[PDB]
Amino acid sequence: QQPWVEKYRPKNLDEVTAQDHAVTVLKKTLKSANLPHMLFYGPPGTGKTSTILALTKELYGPDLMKSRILELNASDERGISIVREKVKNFARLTVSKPSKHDLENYPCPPYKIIILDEADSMTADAQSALRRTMETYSGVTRFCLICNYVTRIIDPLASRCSKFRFKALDASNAIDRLRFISEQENVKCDDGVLERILDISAGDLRRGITLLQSASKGAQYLGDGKNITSTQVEELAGVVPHDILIEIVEKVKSGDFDEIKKYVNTFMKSGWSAASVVNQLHEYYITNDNFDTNFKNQISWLLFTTDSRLNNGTNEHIQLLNLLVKISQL
Amino acid sequence: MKLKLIVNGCEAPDDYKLLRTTINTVASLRKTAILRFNSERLTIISTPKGTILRGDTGQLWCTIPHDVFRLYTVISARELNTITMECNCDSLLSVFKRYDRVMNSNMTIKLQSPICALGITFEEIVKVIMHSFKVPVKLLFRAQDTRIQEPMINYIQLMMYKLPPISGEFGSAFHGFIRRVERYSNVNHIHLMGVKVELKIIVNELDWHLEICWNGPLDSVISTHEVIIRCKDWKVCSKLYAAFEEVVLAISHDESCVFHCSLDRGQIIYYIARSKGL
Amino acid sequence: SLWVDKYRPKSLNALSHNEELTNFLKSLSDQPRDLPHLLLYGPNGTGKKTRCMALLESIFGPGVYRLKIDVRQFVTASNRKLELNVVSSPYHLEITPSDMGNNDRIVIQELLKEVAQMEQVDLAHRYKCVIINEANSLTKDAQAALRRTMEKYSKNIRLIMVCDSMSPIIAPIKSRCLLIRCPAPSDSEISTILSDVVTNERIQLETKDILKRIAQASNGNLRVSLLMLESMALNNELALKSSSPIIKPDWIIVIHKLTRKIVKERSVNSLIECRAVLYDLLAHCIPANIILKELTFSLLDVETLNTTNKSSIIEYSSVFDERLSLGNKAIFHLEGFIAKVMCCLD
Amino acid sequence: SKENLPWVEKYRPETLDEVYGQNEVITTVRKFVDEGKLPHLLFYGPPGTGKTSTIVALAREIYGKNYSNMVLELNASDDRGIDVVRNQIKDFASTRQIFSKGFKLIILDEADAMTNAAQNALRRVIERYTKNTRFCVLANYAHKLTPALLSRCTRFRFQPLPQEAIERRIANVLVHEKLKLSPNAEKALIELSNGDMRRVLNVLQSCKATLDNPDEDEISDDVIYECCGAPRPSDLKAVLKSILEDDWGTAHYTLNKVRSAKGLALIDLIEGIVKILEDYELQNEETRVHLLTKLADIEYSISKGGNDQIQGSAVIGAIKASFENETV
Ligand SMILES: Nc1ncnc2c1ncn2[C@@H]1O[C@H](COP(=O)(O)OP(=O)(O)OP(O)(O)=S)[C@@H](O)[C@H]1O
Ligand SMILES: Nc1ncnc2c1ncn2[C@@H]1O[C@H](COP(=O)(O)OP(=O)(O)OP(O)(O)=S)[C@@H](O)[C@H]1O
């Protein structure tokens, strides 16, 4: 029918999980009419677009929504001229009248909402333009800015907008939602799974849902009618097996440059992701009791530097080889 | 198998014009057209059989009788002597317009040169001048003809509308109402609407909510019924209405618009698929 | 046609080098309706595009391989004319936004939002896939449009983007896709594929060892190994011996010569000659990232260097690769890497 | 309908007596009004410190009723290129005043967003039509203003709001909304505000929304931290103690447990630990350099995103390593 992420997107504010602070504030705003300008920020896949769509629906209903909502995202031009003309014109617009059905069934507060999703992709000029548009029309229009990186939002807009931080969805936060989705889609999982899914998917319920869907598709294609094991989950999540990681650690322990170079060549031929293996190396080294404090300090800084360099779209082979060579000389 | 027909413009200008009307419509829709040369009728089909980056979904299924042709000798190994044939529409347009220009004598078409060809022959008098044309065609098989089937339309929501004829008091008025949507450059998706009667063409834009209506009395061939379609389909509809006296406009709520045109018989149906869901 | 294209597996059952990945692809293609967005990542030349096309054939049937190419025009902020080639077959679309530079955002917006909103009803509605080759080359601005385009319009379009080393792919895009890892074939499987190719091609082979040599010299690159096979087939009158030389691309030979020169003579004039060689390499549109990678891994293969020199070389290579990622002119960082290497070797 | 507005643009001052914090600026502008002479003003300071409020209240006080036809206000939302400055501003400050008399006001909100060409054109308008028009330039960043434009303006600096101003405004809002506030909640709000009143009003609105019955229940520091999603000071002290004293494994475990207890972010912990360490008396001086450099690098990397576990362990390792010089 549909991918489980878009199939199980929350429809009302009750379905949004583990973000209680923002959701209670918004639910209380439902019965009031003084909704502020909101700045939704948090890690990817934490429930921000879901929250804003659920609130907008609960506010206006399917009918008034089309006339009282303007959504701008990164897929459309949002330059200084667009911010100065289209957003200002929509804010200037008078509030369209509700119908009888809208007035009785939905709350229909006396204002319109401008949702600026992916606001971290806007230049500082456009945000400076938005400052006074947000301010001088605060009684007729409300602004919602959604982003992952707050630092990309200029200080004036961050001051005007009320800040709603969305927590990362760990195992404890999203285990109930994952169980709900698994049970309703008839997913047979071994105990321990649905927690490994959320541990691999660090602060990301979209990734966890897609992982569950892929595991379900595999277990259904097998036709064997057995549960999903954690090993399968780690296999199709891109996690390096513990034996390969152990070989990496043992070749690092014997600090011979040529052996490490050859092993890294074969491993990068195996197609793994450098970020994932760097993360696994972090877990192995920092949690190991066989190393002293000095080694752990140096390894923590080395892993931080490697992660920062990998985040810049560099060469995975060179970065991984340099990291492992540095570890071998620690 | 053998294919040959006799078409004279002078004996029946009306059905010959209907034939030329069809050739142009199938050319305008897209290239090529299936000529289902049945032994007892001709059906000219222009179907996408879909779209990937264009939007072509419009399907025109024109039925013309055999009596239109003076001679319609058609034989083959298929059921009821069915020959199905695809040819580029530009060449057929050129052939038909050349014959029309010469007439302004009979036109003889025989199947003569997998990839076959047709042969169009006719004489011009100013003196004896012969005009011979050869359009490259393809011998389509029965199996490929089987998959070409006209779209079946439901009748649970298909409200019919009997549009006023092109000739008469309302003929120019309704033509103007139909073509009034063409005078804007930001109109790509028109939104038909019918309330149980009125025919409202609704344009949705941020500038101003345009709501063209039709105040004239309108009948039904026999509740809202709204269908959003593209503008090229409406251009084809206007061109169909221009050359058709009896026209039926059928609407499927949030589904498709069926433009039924008849010539009391040679019938033309244009199937138009919704572009956006209301 | 080349032997890479002549013997391309046209079906999901015709892929015979990874098996487990084929099983996963069949599991995905069993029920195409709930197909998610896919991200195929693995070493270059392993066969990711072949796997995508095989999955598309499994879903939409034969006919996905009837590619029609058309040129569609764009307009930028400065109103210049850009022409992107869109290899379009029925049931799917191919786009290489990297054909334009930083101006790929307008493509990812116009061309993709056009098809995302445009439905595929013909009463029955299908979803048309879109293939994005080289997803790494997007400039963090095309990806920002991409994420909402595919999140909101999932009902009508499906995205299958191929890439290698998906680190330059942003977290919102990676979180929105199913991550499919495509490992490179082992030398045995490459040798088996080459054996099938030579058998179907009537090339006289002296011994099977000369196929393992091709497989090892290609470094797990099916296309590169097949191109080597055809090269020595047509340069030895279709009869290959153990005396037949392993042939490598010209730029690889140039980089190895540069490595030899850098190790041998280390002076400012040598630096200038190395700069001339690097400019010649860049004149052949060889990306600077792979130039630096090949230079580093050729300098680490020299046996006259001790462990300290090799560790310094790899450290400088990592530093200057990060610099090259954030830079604008490649020659600064290439020259800096070569100068640091020449200063550390002595 | 002032009950249908966010708390920030519901308690915007209407008179100069309602602008707290900037005692000197308000006193001087009141004296300028009383004496009848107003120079070309320039208001500069951090966001949310009372610049637009002050200028609008001052203009309302000068022109109580003629405000519509006596003040021309422009901001970043309006195009202010060379043509706008040449035509609109000049024609406004070139015509005689409405009603009996006076001087026209031209307020330029967010003038640091203006190009250098527009400011260069504006300088001669300022110097030429000053007899009957006065300018007010509002700016957060003074480096975007041409030195000539700064030269021909009287500079007034808006300091970040002190404790007393925020406390008085909080008391006013609590009286207006029939809300209660614990003294510890008051301190927490003061510290999170960082000299901004918009932040205070937004947080207070969210705190009223959080409460089940905002007519009976108070607001404690617990509600403050729960709604704003910030680490409690006790949590920051515990994390720093675990990092400094305990070994690596238990320090990492304590960091993760504290983070997962309330879903805290690592950047908030970093800022809290930096604020705590700034009071620390370091004895090696290289302990500070290492701390500042490493933590700035970690904060920048966090701002660009990435692996949270790696960054947290990097924070722990950076702190333990730097404090190695302290004992040296
Ligand atoms: N708290 C939540 N409760 C329920 N579903 C959630 C929650 N957070 C995320 N999801 C699911 O995650 C998927 C996408 O989440 P979204 O909120 O739409 O995306 P997002 O949070 O904006 O991440 P971005 O846009 O990349 S920053 C949907 O399938 C949601 O159901
Ligand atoms: N001195 C003050 N006294 C009372 N409320 C204040 C004061 N300063 C700011 N505020 C509040 O802050 C809100 C917005 O601050 P403004 O002064 O209008 O913005 P601003 O000072 O111009 O900052 P920028 O540069 O425009 S982001 C007002 O509506 C008041 O509620």
Ligand SMILES: Nc1ncnc2c1ncn2[C@@H]1O[C@H](COP(=O)(O)OP(=O)(O)O)[C@@H](O)[C@H]1O
């Ligand atoms: N299982 C296989 N059997 C035979 N040939 C294959 C197989 N997989 C890949 N190839 C060959 O590899 C060549 C290049 O692979 P390609 O799909 O271009 O890799 P990439 O997707 O990384 O560019 C193709 O020409 C194809 O013929």
Ligand SMILES: [Mg+2]
């Ligand atoms: Mg989103």
Ligand SMILES: [Mg+2]
């Ligand atoms: Mg202001």
